[PDB]
Design a protein around this nucleic acid. Sequence first.
RNA 1: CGCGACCUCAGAUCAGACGUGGCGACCCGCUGAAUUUAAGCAUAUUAGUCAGCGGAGGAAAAGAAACUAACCAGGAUUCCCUCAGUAACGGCGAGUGAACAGGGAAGAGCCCAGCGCCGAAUCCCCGCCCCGCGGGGCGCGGGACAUGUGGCGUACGGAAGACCCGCUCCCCGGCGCCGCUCGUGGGGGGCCCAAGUCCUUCUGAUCGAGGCCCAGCCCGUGGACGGUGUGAGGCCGGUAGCGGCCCCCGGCGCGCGCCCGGGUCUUCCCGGAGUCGGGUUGCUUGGGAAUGCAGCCCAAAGCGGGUGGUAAACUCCAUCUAAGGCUAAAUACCGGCACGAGACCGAUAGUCAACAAGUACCGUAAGGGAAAGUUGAAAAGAACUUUGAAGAGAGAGUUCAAGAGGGCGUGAAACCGUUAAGAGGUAAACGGGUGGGGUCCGCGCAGUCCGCCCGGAGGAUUCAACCCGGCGGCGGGUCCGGCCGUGUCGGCGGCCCGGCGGAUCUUUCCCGCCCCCGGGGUCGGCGGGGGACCGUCCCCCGGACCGGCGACCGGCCGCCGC
RNA 2: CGGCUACCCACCCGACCCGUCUUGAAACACGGACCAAGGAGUCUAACACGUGCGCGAGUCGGGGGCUCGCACGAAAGCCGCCGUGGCGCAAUGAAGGUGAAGGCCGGCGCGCUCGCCGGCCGAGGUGGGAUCCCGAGGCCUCUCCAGUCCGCCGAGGGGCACCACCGGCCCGUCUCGCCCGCCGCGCCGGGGAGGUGGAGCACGAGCGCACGUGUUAGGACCCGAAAGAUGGUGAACUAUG
RNA 3: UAUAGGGGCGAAAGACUAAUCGAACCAUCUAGUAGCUGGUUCCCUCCGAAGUUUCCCUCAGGAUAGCUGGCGCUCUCGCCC
RNA 4: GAGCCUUGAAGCCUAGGGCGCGGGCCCGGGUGGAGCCGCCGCAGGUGCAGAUCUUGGUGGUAGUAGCAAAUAUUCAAACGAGAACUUUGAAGGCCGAAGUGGAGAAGGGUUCCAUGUGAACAGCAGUUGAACAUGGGUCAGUCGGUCCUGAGAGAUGGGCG
RNA 5: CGACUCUUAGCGGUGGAUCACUCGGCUCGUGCGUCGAUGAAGAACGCAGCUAGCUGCGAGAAUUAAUGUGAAUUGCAGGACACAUUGAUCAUCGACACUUCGAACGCACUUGCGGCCCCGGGUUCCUCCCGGGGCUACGCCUGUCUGAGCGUCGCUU
Lengths: 260, 205, 127
Amino acid sequence: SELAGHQTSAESWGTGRAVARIPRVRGGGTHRSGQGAFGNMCRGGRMFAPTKTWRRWHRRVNTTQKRYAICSALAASALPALVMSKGHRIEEVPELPLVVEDKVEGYKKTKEAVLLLKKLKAWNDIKKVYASQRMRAGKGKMRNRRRIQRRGPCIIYNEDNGIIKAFRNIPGITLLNVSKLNILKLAPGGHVGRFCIWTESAFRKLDELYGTWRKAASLKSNYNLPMHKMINTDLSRILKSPEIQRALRAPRKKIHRRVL
Amino acid sequence: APSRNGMVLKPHFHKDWQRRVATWFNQPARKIRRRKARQAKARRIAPRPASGPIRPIVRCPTVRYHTKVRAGRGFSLEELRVAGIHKKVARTIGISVDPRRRNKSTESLQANVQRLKEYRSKLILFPRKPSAPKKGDSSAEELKLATQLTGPVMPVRNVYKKEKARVITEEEKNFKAFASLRMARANARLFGIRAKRAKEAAEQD
Amino acid sequence: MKFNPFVTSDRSKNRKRHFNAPSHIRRKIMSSPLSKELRQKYNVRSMPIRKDDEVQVVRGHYKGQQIGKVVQVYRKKYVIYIERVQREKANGTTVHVGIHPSKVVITRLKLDKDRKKILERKAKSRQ
RNA sequence: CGCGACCUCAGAUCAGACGUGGCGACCCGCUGAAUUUAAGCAUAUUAGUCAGCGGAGGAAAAGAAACUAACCAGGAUUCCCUCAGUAACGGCGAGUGAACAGGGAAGAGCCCAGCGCCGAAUCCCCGCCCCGCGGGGCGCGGGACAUGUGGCGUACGGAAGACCCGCUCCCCGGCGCCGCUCGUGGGGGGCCCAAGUCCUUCUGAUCGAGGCCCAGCCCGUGGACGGUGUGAGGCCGGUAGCGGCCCCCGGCGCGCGCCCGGGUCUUCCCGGAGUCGGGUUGCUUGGGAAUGCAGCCCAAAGCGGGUGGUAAACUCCAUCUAAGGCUAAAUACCGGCACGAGACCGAUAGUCAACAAGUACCGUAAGGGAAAGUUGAAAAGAACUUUGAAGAGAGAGUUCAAGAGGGCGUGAAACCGUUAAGAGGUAAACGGGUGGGGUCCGCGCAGUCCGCCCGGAGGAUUCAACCCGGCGGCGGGUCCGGCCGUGUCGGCGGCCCGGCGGAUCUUUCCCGCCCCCGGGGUCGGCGGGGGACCGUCCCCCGGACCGGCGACCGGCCGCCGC
RNA sequence: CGGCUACCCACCCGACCCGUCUUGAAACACGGACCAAGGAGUCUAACACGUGCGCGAGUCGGGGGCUCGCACGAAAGCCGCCGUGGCGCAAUGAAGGUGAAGGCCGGCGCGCUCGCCGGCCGAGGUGGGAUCCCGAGGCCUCUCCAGUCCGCCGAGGGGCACCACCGGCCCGUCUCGCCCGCCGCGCCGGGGAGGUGGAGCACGAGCGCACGUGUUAGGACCCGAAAGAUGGUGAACUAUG
RNA sequence: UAUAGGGGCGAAAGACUAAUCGAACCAUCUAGUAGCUGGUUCCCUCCGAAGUUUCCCUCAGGAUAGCUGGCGCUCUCGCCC
RNA sequence: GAGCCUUGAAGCCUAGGGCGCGGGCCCGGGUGGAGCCGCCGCAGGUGCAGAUCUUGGUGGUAGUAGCAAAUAUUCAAACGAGAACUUUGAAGGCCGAAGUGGAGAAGGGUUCCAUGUGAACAGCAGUUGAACAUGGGUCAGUCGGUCCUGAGAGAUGGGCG
RNA sequence: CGACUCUUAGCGGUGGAUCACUCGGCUCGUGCGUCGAUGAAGAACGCAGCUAGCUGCGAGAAUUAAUGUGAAUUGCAGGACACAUUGAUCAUCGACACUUCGAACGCACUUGCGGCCCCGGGUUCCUCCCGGGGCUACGCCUGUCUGAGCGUCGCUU
Ligand SMILES: [Mg+2]
Ligand SMILES: [Mg+2]
Ligand SMILES: [Mg+2]
Ligand SMILES: [Mg+2]
Ligand SMILES: [Mg+2]
Ligand SMILES: [Mg+2]
Ligand SMILES: [Mg+2]
Ligand SMILES: [Mg+2]
Ligand SMILES: [Mg+2]
Ligand SMILES: [Mg+2]
Ligand SMILES: [Mg+2]
Ligand SMILES: [Mg+2]
Ligand SMILES: [Mg+2]
Ligand SMILES: [Mg+2]
Ligand SMILES: [Mg+2]
Ligand SMILES: [Mg+2]
Ligand SMILES: [Mg+2]
Ligand SMILES: [Mg+2]
Ligand SMILES: [Mg+2]
Ligand SMILES: [Mg+2]
Ligand SMILES: [Mg+2]
Ligand SMILES: [Mg+2]
Ligand SMILES: [Mg+2]
Ligand SMILES: [Mg+2]
Ligand SMILES: [Mg+2]
Ligand SMILES: [Mg+2]
Ligand SMILES: [Mg+2]
Ligand SMILES: [Mg+2]
Ligand SMILES: [Mg+2]
Ligand SMILES: [Mg+2]
Ligand SMILES: [Mg+2]
Ligand SMILES: [Mg+2]
Ligand SMILES: [Mg+2]
Ligand SMILES: [Mg+2]
Ligand SMILES: [Mg+2]
Ligand SMILES: [Mg+2]
Ligand SMILES: [Mg+2]
Ligand SMILES: [Mg+2]
Ligand SMILES: [Mg+2]
Ligand SMILES: [Mg+2]
Ligand SMILES: [Mg+2]
Ligand SMILES: [Mg+2]
Ligand SMILES: [Mg+2]
Ligand SMILES: [Mg+2]
Ligand SMILES: [Mg+2]
Ligand SMILES: [Mg+2]
Ligand SMILES: [Mg+2]
Ligand SMILES: [Mg+2]
Ligand SMILES: [Mg+2]
Ligand SMILES: [Mg+2]
Ligand SMILES: [Mg+2]
Ligand SMILES: [Mg+2]
Ligand SMILES: [Mg+2]
Ligand SMILES: [Mg+2]
Ligand SMILES: [Mg+2]
Ligand SMILES: [Mg+2]
Ligand SMILES: [Mg+2]
Ligand SMILES: [Mg+2]
Ligand SMILES: [Mg+2]
Ligand SMILES: [Mg+2]
Ligand SMILES: [Mg+2]
Ligand SMILES: [Mg+2]
Ligand SMILES: [Mg+2]
Ligand SMILES: [Mg+2]
Ligand SMILES: [Mg+2]
Ligand SMILES: [Mg+2]
Ligand SMILES: [Mg+2]
Ligand SMILES: [Mg+2]
Ligand SMILES: [Mg+2]
Ligand SMILES: [Mg+2]
Ligand SMILES: [Mg+2]
Ligand SMILES: [Mg+2]
Ligand SMILES: [Mg+2]
Ligand SMILES: [Mg+2]
Ligand SMILES: [Mg+2]
Ligand SMILES: [Mg+2]
Ligand SMILES: [Mg+2]
Ligand SMILES: [Mg+2]
Ligand SMILES: [Mg+2]
Ligand SMILES: [Mg+2]
Ligand SMILES: [Mg+2]
Ligand SMILES: [Mg+2]
Ligand SMILES: [Mg+2]
Ligand SMILES: [Mg+2]
């Protein structure tokens, strides 16, 4: 608001002239003179708590939690059930995370890009984005956002050599870099497991950029991969292991209901 | 107004702070402005390096930061005279000159003098007319570069005096006890009063 | 995707410039495509329409095979009026129907030295 | 008596030139409350702010120390993070509250009065000639300013003058043109890709499935708008170190005008006054035995003066050199000129104002100050007949629709008219329980249940039962035959044909240096480089474990379709 | 034919009109004619506690810098010889300042309400204390023998966390006595035994982000005054020349 | 025509000063403050009070204790004691 | 969500069917014509019965009070669709020269005059008007301002700030 | 039997709530730095063929000239339709113009009253003669001109 409905000079009547105790604009002739002045319950007045510009908008996150979220999103992008449950069409798609040759990053046109997506069967995921490019619901159409266009695959690379030109206007695609991994691009909407397409140099630089549990990251300064909470975490295998079932009481499956 | 066991609070909000709220919404704006300022300087001004003049090795005045070191302001005219060049000739060569900085230590004097010798060795200058005073040919293919970053010499140089391998020695280990500090403290607190009593002992015959 | 920081995707600003564009902009607004044989013969995609162009209406209440000549161009209403396209009032007086020039296929242009210069610039810029 | 010169002066519609006033978001100078808090109110806080007055620029102010510090010292001003809600101030209550460090953006330093030396070598004006595009200067001839002091040389970081040394050959202001540059310098005009194909709904299509085994077509262009609806291709827009022209600014290269610094030695010079400071009194500050500013009085020194945070005396030491001046940068901007975006509002909201809004209107005036958006795709805004004087109807007509007819999208509630149904002396209305009536729903109302197995009744089909032929899958043995995982050695192998880290080494390795006697002394001390050793990955074979989400082949039983 | 139901009517019983101030409202207490829209615990800073996450004796880049000119990019990524800095790892004192390990064994000075030398252990003890360990014993259809097998346990032991108590250590004061060392033998420093004050030590648990509650200051849940100050406009009414 | 706000003017009533005068009007500080009135917006479930101690220029208020809720933690029975 | 739809979204109405205990919801039927929703997270200017609540609209009151200060109207004709009111004739009255008359100053600004309309206005009505639309109208040496000073207001010199 | 009243449903009338749209606001950020004595900001008055407001302009008055683009403005009659002539509209605008008040400037402002110089006519000339053009505010700086001083001095009666 920043300059509210307090532009109208006003006073209260009091006891006599017994409309109310609200301030009233003072004058004559104009039929506004005598109406409700500034205050939250009046016409043309002032809003309750005028939302100032010094609200705490931006929120700092720990960098270890940022890198933890990047590692969690990239790990969840590898399991096929997670990305199929996010909704990408991975029926005819070959082996998980896809590693293409280094001739892909030197594309110049987009016909080769579309042909590559058709040959690697990501064109079904692009066709889903073609099928869903409808109009925005609600009053959000006024502020220049009229397209519900769902996210498709994300191609992650290094050494930009025309791959942004090849993948710049495909609907639903995401331009994304190895050295600058975005959480907002790797997991849009906070839902993990987005379909990603890597490259040879990308898929080799990931280990250089984060490491293993044996060595540190050689590109970052003081980062290690986080220690896993459960080493071998197949709960059904653990509960059907002989060591656990050697030390159980008995399966007690009687009910013993109410006796009248 | 107060409550259960909590800290006594005195906020400084009685003054009309709502008018003067300077919130950094233009902080990426200033960042992009200052990036373009530095890049426009490095493009248009010269093939001089960014952060142009060379800064001295300087110790910080405290009992707190004097173990550390700092890039100072200028080269302390006695130091520049020992290096042997004129003042504004040094300023145009690229030497930062501060006429206020004195010289107490011959150690820091010779440190800045050797730093000047290193900078004059690393200097490659280009005069206007191609008669070549104080240069030669295209040395190192015009030096292979024309821009340095974050100081010319990285002027920190945190010295590592190690002095590791030595054997524990004779009666200094039985001589350097705690009582030396208390004796020095008592001597510093009672220096002048003993001199007054000695003067009175010489006076009263 | 829009990459210039000096042009709007803004709906209010685009509609404001569109409905308050001056006449030299409204001529570029009221541009019409060409027939396939004339674009094959001239190597140009579209032209601004003028007073004496021949028009085949492609869409609306009248569709195709009605190659007539325009008579008036209201640039204030973004409306050309075509001689063949008629509609009677209540009182039996005919009046021309509003046709937007983007739903108009030009079959023949009007020859002029200025239009030859425009056609040469179109062909050279299409290259 | 008169004439002349200087000095104080006055006049003009004298020749030429300059200030007024406006905006005022940012900045500078003065001034200045009170509501409020202290649960009361005087000190205090609100506040060195609101209001008032005076000034200018795109920035202003400040700015080259009469500084900070007190130790291994730094070193113009501004701005941010810290210092820090700390030192300190305060009816020591409420509350108020910096700074030096240190890390960052920026980096630029300088000039004058005095001291003397130069024959005032200086500057303004008038007139003619050398001359230039769009306009103004180097010379020529005389009227002034200035010796009560112009200009050069000079500035506290020392300077100047005369010998000796060995060198430098310099600059900045015109004028035509060349290829340019990091967005491929500034802005302005005009132009640049690809279905409008076939079928069908629709008033209208931008809707609906498809366009050959190369995915109909363009894409460095799938942002957005208008178009009769929901568009990448139908249209200006969008991408592009895409392209052509016109206009403007910069830095190369022909003439006119200026052109002596460094080191040694000798001599000489060396500084801002009613100012600092002291007393006193007001305001202000965190500044307290008084931080800053100001009034009155007293009012200097030259081994001086100020600062050194508790007043005063003596003494030592550190640092600076005031009472003269200029200066871009980072910084601020709710006014203005264009510009872009929005987890914002959507006509009682958002600016008072989406509209002939500071408008209508009110008050003498200072001033106060609104309500008010939407027909349709296109007016195609209803021709014509008829009743009435007209307002208004009845027909007819346009449109997909007047169930859109000129404040006309949608059209609720309160309220009212009529129709249909029901009831009526305890004002109306309500909760529990039924009964009656009415609208409406599901169903066929003596005729409505399904799914499996088996024994009978009639017709038609081909597997299954068993085997041969075949691909695909599960399962495990020899883990045959190979990959990969875990500790462990070894080849110390890529240690010189390797990565990372170590205030663990090597003065018998090297270089730039210091010390002692051009050479010698590890004799000792600093820095850099080579390697020496420690803690994880890169190949190998060999064993041990796991053959486990790591997977192939050979074979086996048990699945399976054709 | 069936049908509860926001349709209507009748009948029996019960049933004063809501909201708040109040001990007490249907009140002869106040507000409400009716209807539609708007309308009241927000935001910032600070603190405390709890919860959730990351790292963990460390933690955090919020301040800048680096990436090619990209719509989302005012995002995100990185700095490490950017950790300066904030908080914590150290407290106690007004301050000068000082500043948290003790115990055992053997030898000796008169083991003397007393100091020295060598070696060892190491954050002390008591009573409770989840859990954990050893295990008497007996228990599996008809003969001795065995291994896991069905199957617990008397009694004992080490004792997490935390509670109570005792003891020890540090800092400032208080009382009493003796000793040691000299970059120089002094109104020099240090030490000992008890009694107290501390927000301490006695193997450290913090940092950052987010969410919830509460408090404080800001207009602070909304509306409300009699009042005060600053700057301007009126003698066209009236009062007086 | 002159006197303009703590001012004017008053044969004096504190009367008049533009329907307002025991201090005019307009705008700003200002959304002044209030321990004092009125109001405070969806459902269900579970628990559920006090008008009392002490202190205050305290008596219509607040602080503290008490009453209450929420979040847990440490344990114990679950096989003649 | 390969979500819904111009073969009809939001919105609204509903003696329809139903669910939940409720916050509310789903479907049927009718207008409507272009946008809307389910799930997981996210963020609020997020829920109304009151505040002598603000804005806007509408009832009972109610076809009620009221259209009563100043003596008063009546007949005929005309224009007109239409006359208690307009115009004319005639009669009867009032104001009665300190006027219900003829003209000015201040103030109003076209209200003055002619023609036409009667939906607005005149508190009933009009064929009428100071309403509306169209078109006209104010002529100065000798009327006044202009000139002069009156109480007073005011700038330079000057002083103060 | 009807009237009145009550409760629903349909239709109709007041009403403009909800929903949908937005040439409008609000917030944030970037770029530039611009008023006037050569008449600013502001105000008055006037200007269109039919023209009240807003917008645009200043007696050249809904714009003039020039450049760019290229066949219109439009509600209606008109008019240049010419383009192998100069060419309608629109944008830019760098050239011309810009009434009066206003810092406002000849005095005060009652559109009042002057005063100089020059040019055209009216008695071919001023002598308080009509029209037109230029000038006429305060403060101040530099220089020129004029002159006041028993302020100081030289020479001279
Ligand atoms: Mg305000
Ligand atoms: Mg206000
Ligand atoms: Mg508002
Ligand atoms: Mg909605
Ligand atoms: Mg409380
Ligand atoms: Mg305040
Ligand atoms: Mg906008
Ligand atoms: Mg001014
Ligand atoms: Mg109070
Ligand atoms: Mg008081
Ligand atoms: Mg103060
Ligand atoms: Mg002010
Ligand atoms: Mg300016
Ligand atoms: Mg100086
Ligand atoms: Mg702190
Ligand atoms: Mg306090
Ligand atoms: Mg203060
Ligand atoms: Mg589109
Ligand atoms: Mg569209
Ligand atoms: Mg196109
Ligand atoms: Mg002195
Ligand atoms: Mg001194
Ligand atoms: Mg001292
Ligand atoms: Mg002192
Ligand atoms: Mg100075
Ligand atoms: Mg100065
Ligand atoms: Mg600046
Ligand atoms: Mg609305
Ligand atoms: Mg509004
Ligand atoms: Mg339309
Ligand atoms: Mg008729
Ligand atoms: Mg319809
Ligand atoms: Mg309507
Ligand atoms: Mg409709
Ligand atoms: Mg519509
Ligand atoms: Mg209705
Ligand atoms: Mg009835
Ligand atoms: Mg009660
Ligand atoms: Mg009572
Ligand atoms: Mg009541
Ligand atoms: Mg009432
Ligand atoms: Mg509401
Ligand atoms: Mg916590
Ligand atoms: Mg540190
Ligand atoms: Mg108030
Ligand atoms: Mg007071
Ligand atoms: Mg005043
Ligand atoms: Mg009077
Ligand atoms: Mg009187
Ligand atoms: Mg007062
Ligand atoms: Mg009165
Ligand atoms: Mg009073
Ligand atoms: Mg007062
Ligand atoms: Mg309030
Ligand atoms: Mg209970
Ligand atoms: Mg008491
Ligand atoms: Mg009490
Ligand atoms: Mg009460
Ligand atoms: Mg309590
Ligand atoms: Mg409890
Ligand atoms: Mg829903
Ligand atoms: Mg609200
Ligand atoms: Mg919102
Ligand atoms: Mg309501
Ligand atoms: Mg309520
Ligand atoms: Mg009310
Ligand atoms: Mg009424
Ligand atoms: Mg009656
Ligand atoms: Mg009556
Ligand atoms: Mg008759
Ligand atoms: Mg008649
Ligand atoms: Mg009579
Ligand atoms: Mg009379
Ligand atoms: Mg008439
Ligand atoms: Mg009437
Ligand atoms: Mg008349
Ligand atoms: Mg009229
Ligand atoms: Mg006459
Ligand atoms: Mg006269
Ligand atoms: Mg005066
Ligand atoms: Mg004066
Ligand atoms: Mg309205
Ligand atoms: Mg023209
Ligand atoms: Mg004249």
